[model samples]
Target: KTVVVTTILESPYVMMKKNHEMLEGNERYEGYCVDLAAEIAKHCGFKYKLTIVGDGKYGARDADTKIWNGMVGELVYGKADIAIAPLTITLVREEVIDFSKPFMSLGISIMIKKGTPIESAEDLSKQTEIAYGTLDSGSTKEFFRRSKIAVFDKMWTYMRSAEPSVFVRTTAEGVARVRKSKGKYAYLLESTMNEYIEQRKPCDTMKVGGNLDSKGYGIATPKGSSLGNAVNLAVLKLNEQGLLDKLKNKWWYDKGEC
Candidate 1:
């Protein structure tokens, strides 16, 4: 049986190829997770298909609806057998799905326009001249909302009630708003995506400051899944063999524009 793998479309992770219009199915997409999924499938002996998550969300449950959405939702609802995306491993998510050993480590990071004066989370939290927000319905948003730390708590208060809707629906949207906002906008996203953007063309953005918190990206499967065991072992071997590092360098720094 072909395994259904749910993922997301984000550059350096899973991007539509420049000539994707001429291609069909999986050939139309390529990137780090695409390569990594191929490796995992080859080793685990399964045919798989990659389906980008509907709604482009990273899986957050609605308090009102009590339902899951995004890649995690796909797996929980049996829409996908596995998820080979840059899904972060979180305490809340782990309760609903099984995760392989971390394939990559990352943290919440700040991305700013090239000449923006911001340097750190502290700086962003201390002022209002520059607006900052996270990918809506993502872990970063939850982090601020659930935070007890004084700085983060304060930041959440500001982000929660900002006029004109400070929340953005996607990473691309947030980045676009940052570029178009001139020096007035900053985006908080995973460091992995932040670094990839810094290397892309029209390099007018930069990642600054240490990460807010550290976590790992894991390949996920529905809880008690037969494939999770094999996927976990596969990830361990891939990491031990240096394949993970090879993929990262190949897609990220190797194509450097900055």
Candidate 2:
């Protein structure tokens, strides 16, 4: 049986090529996750198809409906067999699905446009003149929402009630808002992604201060999936052979435009 892999279209992770319309199937995309998925499939000896998550969300459980959405939902509801992307392995997510050992280590971080006065979460939390938020339905958003830490919890309280709504549906939207907000907005996201974007063209955004929380990205599978064991071993083997590092450099540094 073929494995159906669900992922999101996130820069430096899973992205459609400029010439994607001219290609077909998996060949239409390239990025860190695309390369990683190819290696995982080769090691696991499985034929798989790449599918983008429909909801354009990372994944979150709706408090009111109790239903899962995005890539996590795809796995939870049996819509897909595996998820290969820059998906964070969170305790909340782990409770519903199984994840392979982390392939890439990262942490939640702050993203701000150049000249933005915000240097840290504390700075954002202490100010009312500048707006800050995270991608809606993502680990970053959930982190701030559920955090008990004083500064983080306070920032969440402000963002949750901010006029005009600071939350964004996608990273691109958040970044765009930051760029256009004229130093009035900050976007919080994973350090990996924040750093990746900082190297891209225009180079107007920067990751300020240190990361907010430590975490890692992992390949996810439905609970009890037979592929989980093999995928975990594959990631470990790749890390041992330094392929993971090599791929990261190839995508994030070597191809960097700025």
Candidate 3:
């Protein structure tokens, strides 16, 4: 049986080639999560299938119905057997599902147009002329919306009331908004994606602000999946063999931005 793994179309992380249907694993459809998933399957004794998350955004609360996205919904709703996406480990998320020890770590930051005066999240929180927002129901957006931190708390107020059009549906959409809005709009997202974009052609935006907080990405399995233990052990083994570093450099560093 194949383990149905959930993923997303984030650049460098996971992407669909124009000819994806013709390629095999590692040669194509390979990113951080893809490689990691293969390693886990090797140890756990499972075949797998990659299903991109139906929603483009990372999981978070819905102000109206109060639900989640990414693997939270996948596992909760029985859409997937596992999630190797860059899903953050959060206290709230942990209450509902299990996450393995984090395999990747990152923090939140803002991507602004090249000439934007906003140098940091602090600048963004203080400025009223320029507006910023995160992908709706995503980790970054939820962090600000629920944060007790003074600056983030204030930023959340603006975000919640912003027009619906300003709320992006995906990270790619948010990045595109920053590129086209002439410094008037900014996107708050993960450092990993920011760094990946910086090296790409037509990289007109730059990341600003120190990481708001530190977090790690974990493999999410259903509450009682027998594959969890073996998968976690596989991750440790990959780390020990230096394969994790090699993959990062291959996708994030050595490989030019997608």
Top-TM-score structure, candidate number: 1
lDDT of candidate model 3 versus the reference = 0.80
Clashing pairs in 1: none
State which candidate, 2 or 3, has the greater TM-score: 2
Q: How many clashes does the backbone of model 1 have?
A: 0
Clashes of each: 0, 0, 0
Candidate 2 displacement at residue 99 in angstroms: 0.6
Q: How far is candidate 3 from the true structure (C-alpha RMSD, Å)?
A: 2.7
lDDT of 1 by residue, 153-235 (tens): 99899998888788899888988898988888999999999998988767889999999998999999999999999999999
* Ranking of predictions according to TM-score: 1, 2, 3
Least accurate stretch of 10 residues (summed lDDT) in model 1?
54-63
Instruction: Give the lowest summed-lDDT range of ten residues in model 3.
Output: 24-33
How big is the positional error of residue 58 in model 3, measured in Å on the Cα after superposition? 4.5
RMSD of each: 1.5, 1.6, 2.7
The candidate scoring highest on lDDT is 1
TM-score of each: 0.94, 0.94, 0.87
